[PDB]
Amino acid sequence: AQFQCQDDVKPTSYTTEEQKLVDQFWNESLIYLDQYLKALETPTGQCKDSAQATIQTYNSETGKMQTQCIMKYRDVELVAKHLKAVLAEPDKAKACFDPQKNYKAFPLYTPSAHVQNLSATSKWINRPLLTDYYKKIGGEIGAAGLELNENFLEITSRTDTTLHWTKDVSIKGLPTLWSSVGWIPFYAENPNAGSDRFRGGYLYAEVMGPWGNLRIKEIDGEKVGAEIGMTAQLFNTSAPYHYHHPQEIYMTLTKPQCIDQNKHMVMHWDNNQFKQKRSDNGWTVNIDGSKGKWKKWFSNQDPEQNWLTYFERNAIHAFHTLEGCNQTIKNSGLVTVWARTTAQDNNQTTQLCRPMTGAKDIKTMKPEDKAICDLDDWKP
Amino acid sequence: AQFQCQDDVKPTSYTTEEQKLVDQFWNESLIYLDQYLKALETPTGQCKDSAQATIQTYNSETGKMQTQCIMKYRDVELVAKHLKAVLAEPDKAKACFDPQKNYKAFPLYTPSAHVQNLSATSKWINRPLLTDYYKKIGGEIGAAGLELNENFLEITSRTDTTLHWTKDVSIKGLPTLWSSVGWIPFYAENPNAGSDRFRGGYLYAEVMGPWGNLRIKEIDGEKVGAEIGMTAQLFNTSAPYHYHHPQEIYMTLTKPQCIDQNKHMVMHWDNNQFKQKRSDNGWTVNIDGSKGKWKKWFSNQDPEQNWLTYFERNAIHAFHTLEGCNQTIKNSGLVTVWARTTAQDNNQTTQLCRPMTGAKDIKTMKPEDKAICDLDDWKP
Ligand SMILES: C[S+](C)(=O)CCC(=O)O
Ligand SMILES: C[S+](C)(=O)CCC(=O)O
Ligand SMILES: [Zn+2]
Ligand SMILES: [Zn+2]
C-alpha cells in the first residue's frame, strides 16, 4: 500500500534514547489499533460476521433497543480496511506517526505528574499538566477538573477488558499510550456544555486521526476517515444532548459499581419520539423528556453485554452518570474507547441541543429538560 | 590460597577440542563472577562503600522501603572475599570447575534446541531439552513450560545492564554461559508451588555453588557459602510467599515494559505487619494481605533504581508478575542474577507458606490470600 501522511507530519530525527521512547509509544499504539480492529470484526450477540452494536437505545415503534452488526456500515468497513493496511505495513504507517511533542495547532495535556510518571515517554514529551490548568481556572469548574485529574489513574483503571479484548487496552495494559497521548479538556471553556462539574470533569484523547499521533491522510488514494482514541467523564455528571455529522463508535471500558452507574442514550434524528420540522437545509428537532419521559431513552452501559454503540449521522446522544450509586461512590466515572469513522468529510463540529427555555438554565441542563436541536444536512 | 573442591568434583581428561569448549565456559563464568563482585562492591544510592540494597519493601514502623549497604553483612563480605580469591588464582579455582556433562545427582536441562545451538559448548554438553520435558508433561503446566522454553532467548534478552554492570552479564553478552549452565524446572513437580503457569513458567540455574559448575568446598579453611546463578520467571504469574534459612540476593536484569511489570516483596519474619507465635524450635507467621492490603508490600523492580535486594534469614518474599502490561505483553517475564550467601550451613530447603484453611486452594494462591509460614530457627 501507499501511505500519504497529513500535511503537518514533518521529518523528525531522534537520539538513540529518544527513539526508544517513540518506539514504545508506537508499539502500544499498534496494539490499540489491532485490538480495535478485532473489537469491530469479532462476532457478538446474534451477528455472525462482526460485532453487534446498539444503534438506538429506544426505537419508537418497538419500544426496545435496536442493534446492527457494525461491519454492515460501509464507513466501518473502510476503517477496518485502513487499520489492516496500517498493521500489515507498520514501518510505512510509522512515517505518519509522531509524539506531538511540538504540536502547535492547540494545547495538548497530561492529567497530572502522577500520570506522567507512568512512562519515560510521557515525561520526555512534557505536556502541560491539567492540574496546573484547573488550579488557574479556579471555581467549581476547577474543583471538578482537579477531582478528575488528581485521581485520573484510579478513575481510568476501574475497567474490565476481559470479555471483548484479547489484550488489556486500558491504562493498566497500555500505560505508555494513555500517559503520552494528548488529553483535551474539550468542554472546560464552553458555557453551553451545561454544568460546572461536567465541563471540568470531561477529557478525551486521539491516538489516530487528523489530530492524533498517527495522522494518515490517504492510503492507496482513499481518504482515511478513522479517528480513534479514548474518553473519560467524571461520575455524577450529566451532559446536554449531542449531535454531529460524523458517525461515532463507543466501546465502554468501565466496570460499573452498580447496574445504573453509566447510562447512555442514542436515538436517530428522525425517531418519532421527537418532533421534527424541516428548516433551510436541515431539521429542527424538539426533545421533550419531561415528566420522566426521558428515562426510557437511557440504557445501562457495561463492558460485557451493553458495551458497543454505533451512532449514525446526526443521531441524538447523551451520557448520564447521575443515577444510583453515583451518589455514594468516589473517583469513578465513564471511560471508553472512542472513534469516528468519517473524520475527513462534512462538519466535525460537536453540536449541543439548547434549552427550549433559553440560555438562562443552560447550566442546569439534564435529560428531563425540553431541548431544541438544530440539525444541518450533510453532503452525500 | 588453598582450594578444596567439593566431594563430587572428579578429575577428567579432555581432548584438545573438548578442553577448548570447557575453557570458553570457564572464561564466561569468570566474567560473570567478576561482574558479580563489582555489583556488590560498587557504591550506589547514598551508600559510600558498597551497593545500596532493598532489605524490606515495607517497613511497618515507617511505612516505606528499607535499605542497607550490602557489604555491611558479614556473609556478603565473605562472598566477596571468596570471589576475589577465585579471580586472583583462577587456575587453582578451575580445579573445582566442571561442565556437569555427566552430573549424577539430578537432571540438568537446556531450554530448547535453539538455545542449545547458541554455543558449541552447549551442543557438546547435550543436556536433555525442556521443550521435550514439557511436551511429555502436557496440560497447563506443559503449556506454560513450552511458552517459556520455546521463547527463552527472547524473554532472557529483554534486559538492560548498562547502568550497574561494566560487561553485559545477560544471555546477549555471555551466550556460552547461559546456554551451557544447567537449567532446573524447580517447581514443575511441586503441587504446593501454586498455579500451573507459575510451575511450568519457572527456571533457575547455578554457575557457582555446591550444585553448580564451580564447586569449591573451602578456601583457606573457610567454607564457601557463595551460590551464584540466574533465574527466569514467565510473565503473568504469581508465586506463594517464600522463606528459607540462607540469605539471598537478587539483581534484576529485565528492562520492564511498564513500571509495574515485575514486582517483589521482602519483609523480615518479625515485621509487625504479620502475626508471630513462637512454635517448637521456630515461629508461626500469619500473613493477611486480603482486601488490597498486600499491594503496599510489593515494590516495582527494574535494572536501574530498584535493582538490588538482600533477604535476611527466613525473610518472607515473593515475585509477582500479574499487574499492568502483563495483561498485554508477550514473550516476557522476570530475569535476574540470583545468589545465596550461606549455601553450606543450615537448611537449604526453599519453604513455601500455605493457605490458611484446608478449603483454600494452592493452585490459586496470590499475594492477597491469607497464608501461614512455619519458620524454623537456624543455628547461631
Ligand atoms: C469529546 S469527543 C472524543 O470529541 C466525542 C464527544 C461526543 O460527541 O460524543
Ligand atoms: C533456588 S531458587 C529456585 O532460586 C528458590 C527461589 C527463591 O527462594 O527465591
Ligand atoms: Zn458524539
Ligand atoms: Zn528465596
From TrEMBL, chains A, B:
Q: Does the keyword Transmembrane helix apply?
A: no
Which cysteine pairs make disulfide bonds?
A: 5-96, 47-69, 258-325, 353-373
Question: Does the record's keyword annotation contain Zinc?
Answer: yes
- Write out the entry's keywords from A to Z: Metal-binding, Signal, Zinc
- Where, in this chain's numbering, is Zn(2+) bound? 244, 248, 317
Coiled coil segments of this chain: none
Pfam families to which the protein is assigned, alphabetical: DMSP_lyase (PF16867)
Spell out the molecular function terms from Gene Ontology.
dimethylpropiothetin dethiomethylase activity; metal ion binding
Q: Which CDD domains match?
A: cupin_DddY
Q: What is this protein called?
A: Uncharacterized protein
Recorded source organism is Acinetobacter bereziniae NIPH 3
